[PDB]
Amino acid sequence: CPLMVKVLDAVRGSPAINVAVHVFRKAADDTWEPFASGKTSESGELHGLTTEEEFVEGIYKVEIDTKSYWKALGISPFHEHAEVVFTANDSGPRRYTIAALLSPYSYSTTAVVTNP
Amino acid sequence: SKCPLMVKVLDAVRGSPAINVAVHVFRKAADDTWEPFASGKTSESGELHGLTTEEEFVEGIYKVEIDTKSYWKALGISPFHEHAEVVFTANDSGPRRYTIAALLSPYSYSTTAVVTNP
Amino acid sequence: SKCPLMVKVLDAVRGSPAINVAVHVFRKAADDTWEPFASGKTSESGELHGLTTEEEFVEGIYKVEIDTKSYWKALGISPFHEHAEVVFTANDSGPRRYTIAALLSPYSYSTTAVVTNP
Amino acid sequence: CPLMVKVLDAVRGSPAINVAVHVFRKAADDTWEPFASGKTSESGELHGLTTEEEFVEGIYKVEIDTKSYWKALGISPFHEHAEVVFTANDSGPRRYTIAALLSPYSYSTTAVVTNP
Ligand SMILES: O=C(O)Cc1cc(I)c(Oc2cc(I)c(O)c(I)c2)c(I)c1
Ligand SMILES: O=C(O)Cc1cc(I)c(Oc2cc(I)c(O)c(I)c2)c(I)c1
DSSP states (O other): OOEEEEEEETTTTEEOOSOEEEEEEEOTTSOEEEEEEEEOOTTSEEOOSOOTTTOOSEEEEEEEOHHHHHHTTTOOOSEEEEEEEEEESBTBOOEEEEEEEEETTEEEEEEEEEOO | OOOSEEEEEEETTTTEEOOSOEEEEEEEOTTSOEEEEEEEEOOTTSEEOOSOOTTTOOSEEEEEEEOHHHHHHTTTOOOSEEEEEEEEEEOSSSOSEEEEEEEEETTEEEEEEEEEOO | OOOSEEEEEEETTTTEEOOSOEEEEEEEOTTSOEEEEEEEEOOTTSEEOOSOOTTTOOSEEEEEEEOHHHHHHTTTOOOSEEEEEEEEEEOSSSOSEEEEEEEEETTEEEEEEEEEOO | OOEEEEEEETTTTEEOOSOEEEEEEEOTTSOEEEEEEEEOOTTSEEOOSOOTTTOOSEEEEEEEOHHHHHHTTTOOOSEEEEEEEEEESBTBOOEEEEEEEEETTEEEEEEEEEOO
8 A cells, every 4th residue: 555544633633534535647748637536434543545556757746624623523624625735756666654643723734754 | 802803822832822934815816716815923921913904804815824934944944835725704794803724844834713793 | 022931722623722721830940850941821812921930941841731621621622632832941052932833723732943143 | 561651743743762661559648659661662652561460550740752863863852751641451451552642732632542
């Protein structure tokens, strides 16, 4: 698994469950092309998004649908979603973990990159 | 200050405001595309004021894009993100003033919104 | 403002400054214990100014304690932390002004320091 | 494992390795009593700090020696250490994960609490 996502809830102190995540890749014509999608599990993690074979060099955008997550909890959040845009594998294949901590009016994201 | 929208950027590596950071603001148009709205560069205090006025700032979806990549390269540091973006809906129902704050690190960034009405 | 030390607290759940938050500042004494130095409550803008002066603020180790627990209980929310603490060394070598900022959530808090000299 | 710690480095985008962690418990006389200590591993995690049997109700302090971590990297950090103080198991036994993201002039910490 070359691309994984981990989301946590800072209001409840638990993993953010069933959060929709859409992954896009910058196409040749400079437009966002659908690449993969999923929902986080019980532990707030999302795996199996792609393979080393399909995860080629490029600029990717990871969109986390925070808005839907909060509303389903009766909270009216500030952000429409959280976006993480980055260039991947431009110096050979690597493994990426995109982590996100969510709050109604705030979120922070970090990336952990390891060489296989 | 009657500025409806403000931006504040900080540097978590050097513990100082993030200066000369390019900031571009966009608004969602009917045809579902992003059209330029305002832009500028953070000052010596890492702030960016006077991006718009109450009259022009109507309800709708806005995107605030911060060129963090160029900020880090200028310091000789390899960043992870292409840029940082904050997408939100501005409603007159809620308070009046919007402050978008961002704390930057090479592989991480956090952002918060302060919505207060005077 | 010549205030050498400033504190800013924000609420990430309601997107507003954290008001009436108790803040206690301590300094490390020779016998390795913490002795009261200054204290106060954040204002309507979540800020706390005039905690000390240049004369009294000498080099040494300081601890800034924020009573976050009472803040959350007042909102009817069960917090995780007893309080938030920021322990740092103040040196004349480095810049002059210190701003300690904290973003609060029930199960999480982040803090950053802005050190700038005018 | 009822108490685990996870630390990440936001400057290098990797787990924070060999970070010293000391855990204290508030004693009857209102003083901090040593409870456990360790260093994070290759993955930036610290496990095996205590057992469900020894981890009784009380106020605990988790101290992460960030200062030493940064200096060993040639960086002069702002904080002496990072402190997480909390009341644990006051409503029955729970599992705690204390997570921390570190930067030279900043750090954020969150807690994940799950019921066994
Ligand atoms: O997230 C962290 O790790 C710590 C942190 C704390 C605060 I509080 C922040 O927000 C502001 C907002 C205003 I308005 C300020 O003037 C200042 I100084 C900081 C940010 I971004 C980041
Ligand atoms: O930002 C804060 O206030 C605190 C914080 C600390 C960490 I470290 C985080 O990242 C991870 C990454 C992995 I992989 C985990 O398994 C877990 I648990 C948390 C997040 I999001 C938020």
